Design a protein around this ligand. Structure first.
Ligand code: HEM
Length: 154
């Protein structure tokens, strides 16, 4: 699959807004994911002990990792499809080390869309959301393909 330049622009336009507060956006997204799909929290030995949203919100480690996740994903989106090099180490660690099934990647993609929709309605209309979805789908497809090669495919 290939996104058009116009679709990439819609993605990068709203992502520019995200970069105005990466830490805050990362917190929102991770907490949305952990509440909507609590099982995902089990993958984090560091965050497993977090019982409530208030605890998640007060966690400095959770916030720091949100910045790390969004910065990594941001670097991928800005590649506009030419993200092979950025995908290699990401797929290896998530397949071999953490063992993250594709299903969970669909879950966070879901969390990303939800948060952008709430915080940036003016820059996330139906067209922008469609473009963001295509970008995240392309990401999941390439990650999945890489998973297979590494002998995983979750
Ligand atoms: C959608 C984008 C995602 C991106 C871009 C991403 C990115 C990252 C990055 C950059 C790290 C740092 C070093 C490493 O590779 O281990 C990391 C760590 C990790 N990721 Fe993700 N990740 C994503 C989704 C997920 C999902 C869905 C799960 C789990 C439900 C997950 C679980 C983990 C775990 C367990 C670690 C290590 C935590 C620790 O430091 O102990 N990742 N991720």
């Amino acid at each position: 699959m290939v996104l058009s330049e116009g679709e990439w622009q819609l993605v990068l336009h709203v992502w520019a807004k995200v970069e105005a507060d990466v830490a805050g956006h990362g917190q929102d997204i991770l907490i949305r994911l952990f509440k909507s799909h609590p099982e995902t929290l089990e993958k984090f030995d560091r965050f497993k002990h977090l019982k409530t949203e208030a605890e998640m919100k007060a966690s400095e480690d959770l916030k720091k990792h949100g910045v790390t996740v969004l910065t990594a994903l941001g670097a991928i989106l800005k590649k506009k499809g030419h993200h092979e090099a950025e995908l290699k180490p990401l797929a290896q660690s998530h397949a071999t080390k953490h063992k993250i099934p594709i299903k969970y990647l669909e879950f966070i993609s879901e969390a990303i869309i939800h948060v952008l929709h709430s915080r940036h309605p003016g820059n996330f209309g139906a067209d922008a959301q469609g473009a963001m979805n295509k970008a995240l789908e392309l990401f999941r497809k390439d990650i999945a393909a890489k998973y297979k090669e590494l002998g995983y495919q979750g």
